[PDB]
Amino acid sequence: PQGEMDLLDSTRIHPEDYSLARKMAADALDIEDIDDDDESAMRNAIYEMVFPRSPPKDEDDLTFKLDELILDDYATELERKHQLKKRSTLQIIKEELQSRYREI
């Protein structure tokens, strides 16, 4: 997971939103030791979400847990803290994480 290559390089997510996608992936996996500044733990979390080592029954990967996230509150907090309009970007990240480079 710490390697030179990146999971999100095979998706439509821009590199400026890679930490946003990794924070979504880490918060979706119910991790609590995670800190925003720790990029390594973010990469481990997104790697275990997209390529789990022990997937559950009839599930290829843990991407289905993203549907429990409340993206609206996350977009509201992003707009409050950083003055970024990213409401559609969270949806695009979610769709790309669930299926990397669909046929549109």
């Binding site: 979706a28 119910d30 549907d67 996230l69 409340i70 509150d73 996350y74």
Partner: peptide
């Protein structure tokens, strides 16, 4: 110190 934001999950 503040508290790190944790994304709420559907219930």
């Amino acid at each position: 110190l503040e508290i790190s934001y944790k994304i709420p999950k559907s219930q």
